[PDB]
Amino acid sequence: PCPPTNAERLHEFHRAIGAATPERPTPPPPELLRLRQTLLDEESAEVRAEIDHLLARQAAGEALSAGDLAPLAHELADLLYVTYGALDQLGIDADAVFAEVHRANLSKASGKPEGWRPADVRGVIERLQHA
Amino acid sequence: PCPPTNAERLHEFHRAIGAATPERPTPPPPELLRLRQTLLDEESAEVRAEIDHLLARQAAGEALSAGDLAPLAHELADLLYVTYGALDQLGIDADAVFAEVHRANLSKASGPRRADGKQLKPEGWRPADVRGVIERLQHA
Ligand SMILES: O=c1ccn([C@H]2C[C@H](O)[C@@H](COP(=O)(O)NP(=O)(O)OP(=O)(O)O)O2)c(=O)[nH]1
Ligand SMILES: [Mg+2]
Ligand SMILES: [Mg+2]
Ligand SMILES: [Mg+2]
Known part of the structure; x- marks a missing residue:
């Protein structure tokens, strides 16, 4: 009837892989926060790489298509995924x-x-x- | 009649500030790429700052309550806001x-899993x- 929100998708993902995903706000152990920082750094570095690639191609006069945005769109979604994932693992809607x-x-x-x-x-x- | 998604909320925001954004994928100018990156870095650094602070309190031996998570939750929501912001300015659902x-x-x-917990x-x-x-x- 209604698709799940991206946040509820993260709850389904963490349930499927056996990762902590509390129902209510839950103070986390240090190992959780370090990992969430690590996932955020990895995917924001990949976003940065795709923006740089697009900037360089534009500087060389290339005319970007819509298809050329697919890698950047992929990584911005990966960033969302790990950002939602941090909130989900904290038990926070x-x-x-x-x-x-x-x-x-x-x-x-x-x-x-x-x-x-x-x-x-x-x-x-x-x-x-x-x- | 499905409630609005957070991506649809960013389209409402950009409309409300008169910067209304394309409905289909649209290649952007370079200045728009560099602007989105700036917003990403600024909120990413704010998130990183809150994580470091909660880790420093835990390391110090302090016990976090749920309410202690609100500054971090706030910055994680901000980072969603400018990440969804970028996709909306690209005309991308x-x-x-x-x-x-x-x-x-x-x-x-x-x-398998990595030592730090990352799903592989x-x-x-x-x-x-x-x-x-x-x-x-x-x-x-
Ligand atoms: O533990 C995890 C692992 C992955 N993910 C999600 C986030 C993102 O959508 C994607 C990132 O995982 P990877 O880094 O393994 N793959 P990526 O697409 O980023 O390729 P690469 O990192 O090699 O450039 O999987 C999690 O949410 N939790
Ligand atoms: Mg990755
Ligand atoms: Mg990625
Ligand atoms: Mg902020």
Whole structure:
């Protein structure tokens, strides 16, 4: 009926490979955070490589097609994957946090407007521990 | 009637700031590539800073509560925001690309693990075909 969100996809992935994936916000052991840092560094370095390749081809006068974006699109999705993966392994619903960051950002795009409240992610962590 | 995805939220944001973005994959100018990279680096460094700080408190012997995770969760959401931001400015359906990367990643389940926990690829694993997703999106 409705496809899963990318965050729920990460929960399915971690369940399938036997990786920790708690239901509610859970303080992690150091080994988890180190790995999440390592995955983030690997995939952001691959994103950077594809942007450089595209910049170099443009500098040599190449006319990029839509097909030429496939490697960059692949790596930006890998970055999403490891970014969602960090939140999932922390037991933190990424959609709930994103929805609050988006509400703040979108709200700030009016006028910094009157009564603008920044993102309250701590309050999101609280509401997530009671559901 | 399916609720909005986070990729669809970025299209709403870019529209609301009048920088509205293409609906189909669209090669970008160089300045747009360099701008997205800057935003990636800035939020990546903010995420790296929060990870280092939680690791430093744990190393120091301090016990994290769930509420201690909010600065890191916040920066991880920011990094999603500018990563989805880049795909939207390229006219590329992030959800369509992600679904194909996800399919490829589920097939890794029988493979070994690296010492640090990273899932590695089983024998005969086949990569995602994101070129196929771009071609699909481009000819919609
Ligand atoms: O433990 C893992 C392993 C992989 N992944 C996902 C993230 C990303 O979608 C992809 C990255 O895994 P690899 O680094 O093994 N493959 P990649 O496509 O990045 O090729 P390479 O790293 O060799 O350039 O698999 C996880 O989420 N957790
Ligand atoms: Mg990799
Ligand atoms: Mg990659
Ligand atoms: Mg930030």
